[PDB]
Design a protein around this ligand. Structure first.
Ligand SMILES: N[C@@H](Cc1c[nH]c2ccccc12)C(=O)O
Ligand SMILES: [K+]
Ligand SMILES: [K+]
Ligand SMILES: [K+]
Ligand SMILES: [K+]
Ligand SMILES: [K+]
Ligand SMILES: [K+]
Ligand SMILES: [K+]
Ligand SMILES: [K+]
Ligand SMILES: [K+]
Ligand SMILES: [Mg+2]
Ligand SMILES: [Mg+2]
Ligand SMILES: [Mg+2]
Ligand SMILES: [Mg+2]
Ligand SMILES: [Mg+2]
Ligand SMILES: [Mg+2]
Ligand SMILES: [Mg+2]
Ligand SMILES: [Mg+2]
Ligand SMILES: [Mg+2]
Ligand SMILES: [Mg+2]
Ligand SMILES: [Mg+2]
Ligand SMILES: [Mg+2]
Ligand SMILES: [Mg+2]
Ligand SMILES: [Mg+2]
Ligand SMILES: [Mg+2]
Ligand SMILES: [Mg+2]
Ligand SMILES: [Mg+2]
Ligand SMILES: [Mg+2]
Ligand SMILES: [Mg+2]
Ligand SMILES: [Mg+2]
Ligand SMILES: [Mg+2]
Ligand SMILES: [Mg+2]
Ligand SMILES: [Mg+2]
Ligand SMILES: [Mg+2]
Ligand SMILES: [Mg+2]
Ligand SMILES: [Mg+2]
Ligand SMILES: [Mg+2]
Ligand SMILES: [Mg+2]
Ligand SMILES: [Mg+2]
Ligand SMILES: [Mg+2]
Lengths: 56, 117, 150, 110, 17, 142
RNA sequence: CCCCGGCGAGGGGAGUGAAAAAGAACCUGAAACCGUGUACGUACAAGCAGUGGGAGCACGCUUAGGCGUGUGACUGCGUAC
RNA sequence: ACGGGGCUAAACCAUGCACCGAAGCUGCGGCAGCGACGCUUAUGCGUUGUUGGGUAGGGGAGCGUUCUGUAAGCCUGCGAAGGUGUGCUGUGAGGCAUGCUGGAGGUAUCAGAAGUGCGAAUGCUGACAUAAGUAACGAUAAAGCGGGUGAAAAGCCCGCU
């Protein structure tokens, strides 16, 4: 099956009305490093919830 | 003598797409669809210059009919009374007085009732 | 047009408009439909129509004061500075000189003036009698065109 | 003072980069840099390098302050596409388009 | 290129004898 | 000079109350469709809603002639296959009496976004009581 | 030459030049097609999408007003070549 | 199985007077064709009568494009052609002026010659869309982890499974 008429540029933008990305809103601060991270994730420096968890 | 069609064909296409401003979709961008929609818009404009005269007389008659019944007479008897009283005011002006000067319209109704009685 | 007579693709089955030659005038790089050849653009003019039109042109040069008749018109040496000074002596700027029989000094002296053409009575043509503003004829030449035009 | 940075002939479609560019339009450079850090998109790596270059251009060539810059304009244009050939079944050939983009980020404190 | 096989196939193509 | 046109922001609409006791259904509906549309005013404009608000009381006591009380049938289709449904005039009065007058007037009004805005100005009640006393309806004797 | 970037690609300055939106993907740089911004409309509404009428809004004028431009609620007629 | 609502007339028969109703007819302004008569033409004007839907097709009159002559002329770096807007103008094909871009050509008038006008031909060539960020990513023999390098490592190197 294939189209009988060429859909318009308006019908193409209506279908993509739901394709938008949603930014993350929750950047939390570590209480000893002051670094930002995702919640329930370790920091880039290897801290999590105040303590150094990975010595990397 | 070889003739190139670049400059002449561009100016004739650009003339049709200037008359197709405001149309939807390909009707204002694509020449094959714009040309064909500019012709239909001129067929409608020719036909509606005749219909504009019908739709306004149909509007004047309905406003005379409403203002005449406020004075206790129909349209078909108000017009007959004015012809009997040799009044030659057309329907464009009657419908204009019916709205803007309601006491001049009542004088005309009394003149039409006197000619019928 | 250079190429083959091979049919580009078969007649039926391919879902494409039919073709028989890559040389067809519809195609890019194809032939010209009505391609030209060298042709001869010459026309015929009757003798009495050619001589009747020179008499019409010559009569207008005298009516419009564009014909000048002298008895002698020559220069002493084949120098372009001599002729240009001589035509300044007569207020002639853009002129056609018709002589009885061409002398070589006058022909070399006018070769570089692009508004002066020097001609003998036999080699006149209808277009140059109209193209130049003034025409200067020696009366050696005025009587030579009369017998030429009967 | 308005400052521009561009990435021309970036290897990805313009429709994929436009999803990430719509996240940071009108934001502060402080806030646009961490939105791009935690977006899991290949286009978020291309857009963050054009945004970091526009901040360095504004500080160095224009003497601006990082603290007050905002992303006033950002738009993605289409670039030339590269034509490749992909073999299909029964000897048919398809044409592959490898689309590129032109990313333009504009920062200004006003 | 060669045509689609279903356009060649006598059973599919010659359906209305 | 261009013909006067009524502007929807400065048009004055009034309130009336009509008693539908003993009226003929069709001959009452036509006068309602005139005043909802505004055909009784000299400022009548075909693309503006210049009509009036009308409150109809005692919708369950409207009258019909002949054998129309048992023979007039109302049809509608539900959208589902086989779903044609009917109801006589006596059953519509017993179950939902206001719908009898609303169906009649709706068929006499223009079709489109403007004819649906004219219909919003009709208020049909099955009894003798309305609660629009704040609007001060004037009695319209037919 | 300086700056961001991977001692990248790409870009912003500086400089050359009459011109760099003449920067090597280089004279001019149309259309289809794809975007960013602004004004108006659009989530109770049915169809060749215009045409005739027409409110409101925005921006210009110029006035003791109502013209110009853009948009086009609502409404009559209207089944492409 | 009235176009619908609805109708006991808003149905049917008979009589009568009003009104609505078309691009028909009339009124006002304008253009053109064909006759007839003339302020007199010199082939144009004035008065009057009438005509002006149109396919196949016949007849008449024109617009614009490239090239040759007029043109060693005329316009043009104080901005040509081309591109893009705006205004004015003709019954039409069209014309004129000008803002911005462009950066070196253009061409009156009257004649002359045509590769002289494109939406169609499942037309030809190039560019760009749509379906759509959809199907698919090529044997169902299979991977896991630690270390190294690196801007970045599921896929590279080393090691053990
Ligand atoms: N249908 C089969 C066999 C096939 C090949 N060529 C054909 C031509 C006609 C009919 C069938 C075929 C295939 O596609 O492999
Ligand atoms: K060959
Ligand atoms: K330039
Ligand atoms: K370009
Ligand atoms: K373009
Ligand atoms: K409409
Ligand atoms: K120009
Ligand atoms: K075609
Ligand atoms: K797509
Ligand atoms: K696999
Ligand atoms: Mg086919
Ligand atoms: Mg050739
Ligand atoms: Mg001979
Ligand atoms: Mg020479
Ligand atoms: Mg395959
Ligand atoms: Mg193979
Ligand atoms: Mg420079
Ligand atoms: Mg040059
Ligand atoms: Mg260029
Ligand atoms: Mg709404
Ligand atoms: Mg509803
Ligand atoms: Mg339709
Ligand atoms: Mg009917
Ligand atoms: Mg009449
Ligand atoms: Mg009429
Ligand atoms: Mg008529
Ligand atoms: Mg007529
Ligand atoms: Mg005709
Ligand atoms: Mg020439
Ligand atoms: Mg030209
Ligand atoms: Mg200009
Ligand atoms: Mg041709
Ligand atoms: Mg074409
Ligand atoms: Mg055709
Ligand atoms: Mg190409
Ligand atoms: Mg799908
Ligand atoms: Mg799927
Ligand atoms: Mg899949
Ligand atoms: Mg594989
Ligand atoms: Mg590993």
């Amino acid at each position: 099956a294939v189209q009988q008429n060429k859909p318009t540029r308006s019908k193409r933008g209506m279908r993509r009305s739901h394709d938008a990305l949603t930014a993350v809103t929750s950047l939390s601060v570590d209480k000893t490093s002051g670094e930002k991270h995702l919640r329930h994730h370790i920091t880039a420096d290897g801290y999590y919830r105040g303590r150094k968890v990975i010595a990397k | 003598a070889r003739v190139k069609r670049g400059v002449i064909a561009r100016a004739r296409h650009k003339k049709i797409l200037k008359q197709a401003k405001g149309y939807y979709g390909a009707r204002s961008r694509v020449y094959r669809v714009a040309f064909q929609a500019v012709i239909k818009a001129g067929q409608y404009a020719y036909r509606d210059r005749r219909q504009r005269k019908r739709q306004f007389r149909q509007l004047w008659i309905a406003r005379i009919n409403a203002a005449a019944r406020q004075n206790g007479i129909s349209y078909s008897k108000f017009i007959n009374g004015l012809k009997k009283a040799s009044v030659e005011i057309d329907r464009k002006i009657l419908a204009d007085i019916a709205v803007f000067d309601k006491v001049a319209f009542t004088a005309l109704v009394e003149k039409a009732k006197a000619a019928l009685a | 047009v250079t190429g083959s007579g091979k049919k580009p693709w078969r007649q039926k089955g391919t879902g494409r408009a039919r073709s028989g030659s890559i040389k067809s005038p519809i195609w890019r790089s194809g032939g010209v439909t009505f391609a030209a050849r060298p042709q001869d653009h010459s026309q015929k003019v009757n003798k009495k129509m050619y001589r009747g039109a020179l008499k019409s042109i010559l009569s207008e040069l005298v009516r419009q004061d564009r014909l000048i008749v002298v008895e002698k018109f020559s220069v002493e040496a084949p120098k372009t500075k001599l002729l240009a000074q001589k035509l300044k002596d007569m207020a002639l700027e853009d002129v056609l000189i018709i002589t009885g029989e061409l002398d070589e000094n006058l022909f070399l002296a006018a070769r570089n003036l692009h508004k002066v053409d020097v001609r003998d009575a036999t080699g006149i043509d209808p277009v140059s009698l109209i193209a130049f503003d003034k025409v200067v004829m020696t009366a050696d030449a005025v009587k030579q065109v009369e017998e030429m035009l009967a | 003072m308005e400052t521009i940075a561009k990435h021309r002939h970036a290897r990805s479609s313009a429709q994929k980069v436009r999803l990430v560019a719509d996240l940071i339009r009108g934001k502060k450079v402080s806030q646009a840099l961490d939105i791009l850090t935690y977006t899991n998109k290949k286009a978020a790596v291309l857009v963050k390098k054009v945004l970091e270059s526009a901040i360095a251009n504004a500080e160095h060539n224009d003497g601006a302050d990082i603290d007050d810059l905002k992303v006033t304009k950002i738009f993605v244009d289409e670039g030339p596409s590269m034509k490749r050939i992909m073999p299909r079944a029964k000897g048919r050939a398809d044409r592959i388009l490898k689309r590129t983009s032109h990313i333009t980020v504009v920062v200004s404190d006003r | 290129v060669t045509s689609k096989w279903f356009n060649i196939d006598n059973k599919i193509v010659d359906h209305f004898p | 000079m261009k013909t006067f046109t009524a502007k929807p922001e400065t048009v004055k609409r009034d309130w009336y109350v009509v008693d539908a006791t003993g009226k003929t259904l069709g001959r009452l509906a036509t006068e309602l469709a005139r005043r909802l549309r505004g055909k009784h005013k000299a400022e009548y404009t075909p693309h503006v809603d210049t009509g009036d608000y009308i409150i109809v009381l005692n919708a369950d006591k409207v009258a019909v002639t002949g054998n129309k009380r048992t023979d007039k049938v109302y049809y509608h289709h539900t959208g589902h296959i086989g779903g044609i449904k009917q109801a006589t005039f006596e059953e519509m009065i017993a179950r939902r009496p206001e719908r009898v007058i609303e169906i009649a007037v709706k068929g006499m009004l223009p079709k489109g976004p403007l004819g649906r805005a004219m219909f919003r100005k009709l208020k049909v009640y099955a009894g003798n009581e309305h609660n629009h006393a704040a609007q001060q309806p004037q009695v319209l004797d037919i």
